[PDB]
Amino acid sequence: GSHMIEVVCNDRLGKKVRVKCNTDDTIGDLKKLIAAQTGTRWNKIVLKKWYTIFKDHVSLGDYEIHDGMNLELYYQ
Amino acid sequence: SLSIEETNKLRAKLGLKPL
């Protein structure tokens, strides 16, 4: 970090967006990127992976998000 | 997916720093 990575976000119907981001971005910031790139609103997005619900104010780096990582995208 | 430069312009628009 700062270090550019990409993340893949898949929703339950199989729609996929791959987002370029930086390890210092927050989860809330990624969600803003996701939102813009999928026609939705950042505050209606939930990001998970298995048992982890990502908190908005934590950076990707502190969540140890790796390059290429697949995240689960949900709507609220 | 968006290029680095297209991502950077979007980032700029959202108040985020460059990649």
Residue numbers in the entry:
A (entry chain A): -2 to 73
B (entry chain C): 0 to 18
Lines from the paper:
Although structurally very similar to ubiquitin, the highly conserved protein Hub1 does not function as a covalent modifier but binds proteins only non-covalently. Hub1 of yeast and mammalian cells associates with the spliceosome through interaction with the tri-snRNP protein Snu66. Comprising solely the ubiquitin-fold and lacking N- or C-terminal extensions, Hub1 is only able to function through non-covalent interactions with other proteins. Importantly, Hub1 does not seem to influence splicing of all splice substrates equally, but to facilitate only certain splicing events of particular introns/exons of pre-mRNAs. These findings thus lead to the model that the ubiquitin-like protein Hub1 plays a conserved role in the spliceosome as modulator of splicing activity.
To characterize the Hub1–HIND interaction further, we obtained structural information of human Hub1 in complex with a peptide corresponding to the single human HIND sequence. The interaction between Hub1 and the α-helical HIND peptide is mediated through a salt bridge formed by D22 of Hub1 and R127 of HIND, strengthened by hydrophobic contacts involving aliphatic fragments of residues of hSnu66’s HIND and the Hub1 interface. Although Hub1 possesses an ubiquitin fold, it uses the opposite protein surface for Snu66 binding compared to ubiquitin for binding to ubiquitin receptors like Rad23. In contrast, the Hub1–HIND interaction surface is located on the opposite side to the canonical UBD patch formed by helix α1 and sheets β1β2. The X-ray analysis revealed that human and S. cerevisiae Hub1-HIND complexes have overall very similar, superimposable structures with a root mean squared deviation (RMSD) of 0.716 Å. The two structures only show small differences, particularly in protein loops extending opposite of the Hub1–HIND interaction surface. Because RS domains can mediate protein–protein interactions as well, we mapped the Hub1-binding site using hSnu66 truncations and found that the single HIND motif of hSnu66 is sufficient and necessary for Hub1 binding. Testing the relevance of the salt bridge between D22 of Hub1 and R127 of the HIND element for this interaction, we found that a recombinant fusion protein of GFP with the N-terminal domain of hSnu66 (aa 1–139), but not a similar fragment bearing an alanine replacement of a the R127 residue (R127A) in its HIND domain, bound endogenous Hub1 of human cell extracts in GFP-immunoprecipitation assays. Conversely, only immunoprecipitation of stably expressed GFP-fusions of wild-type (WT) Hub1 but not of a Hub1 variant harboring an alanine replacement of the D22 residue (D22A) co-isolated endogenous hSnu66 from human cell lysates. From these findings we infer that binding of human Hub1 to Snu66 does indeed depended on the integrity of this salt bridge, showing that physical properties of Hub1 are highly conserved at the molecular level.
